[PDB]
Amino acid sequence: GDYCGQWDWAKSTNYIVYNNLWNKNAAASGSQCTGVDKISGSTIAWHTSYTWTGGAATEVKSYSNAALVFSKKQIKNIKSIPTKMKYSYSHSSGTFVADVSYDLFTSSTASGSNEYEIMIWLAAYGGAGPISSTGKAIATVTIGSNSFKLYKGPNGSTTVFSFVATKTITNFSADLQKFLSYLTKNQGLPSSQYLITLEAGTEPFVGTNAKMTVSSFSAAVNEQKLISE
């Protein structure tokens, strides 16, 4: 059965699926429910459905997501982060502003507070755009079969990097360590940072009778054979 509470969630050996209606009060009206559909090995299928209208149209209202459960590692010691995400997204006609995105966080300790954030937008709808100090991409980088414009800006004391795919991706397959290593080699992301959070879901701004169905999601963090503390 679905769960619609602001902070509802369901735990699995490898994933936690959150409803996470953390900014629901910025909308004038609406609600959102999330549910888990299957769990086969390290692959999970889940979905979320919502309506959010009015209020602060520019603000993320929620971020239902599947979050990986994993041993935290410093980026310098991560060999690979293989991930897959296949989804569909429907809604009713009219205003629809949202994104499908991975959300990763790093800290200086495995248990520390967020210091850097790395988003990967597989889809941006109705003009949704990431945090950007300048309002302009700082780079265009191709990873695997997809091209991404890179944005950068603050969120409090957090530095937020957002890769935005140049074409919508509905069937994603990538090694996210390539994204982190691009940032450590080119954008000043410290390789001593611990990867502490890896999730994938959707950020709605405005939408009616919307439903994202994640037909399959998986992620894993793999460490190098030689660890340097």
Question: How would you portray this structure in words?
Answer:
It contains 1 helix and 16 strands. Strand 9 (97-107) and strand 10 form a beta hairpin. With 229 residues, the protein is mainly beta. It has one domain (9-213): Glycoside hydrolase family 11/12, catalytic domain (Jelly Rolls), CATH 2.60.120.180.
CATH homologous superfamily assignment: Glycoside hydrolase family 11/12, catalytic domain
CATH topology, which one?
Jelly Rolls
Rg, rounded, reads 17 Å
Overall 3D form: globular
Return the CATH class: Mainly Beta
Q: Cα distance, first to last residue?
A: 44 Å
Any idea how many domains? 1
PDB class: hydrolase
Keywords: xyloglucanase, oomycetes, hydrolase
Assembly: monomeric
Entry title: Crystal structure of the pathogen-secreted apoplastic GH12 xyloglucan-specific endoglucanase XEG1
Compact overview of the structure:
This protein is mainly beta. It is built from 1 helix and 16 strands. Strands 1, 2, 3, 4, 5, 6, 8, 9, 10, 11, 12, 13, 14 and 15 form a 14-stranded mixed beta sheet that branches. Strands 7-16 form a two-stranded antiparallel ribbon.
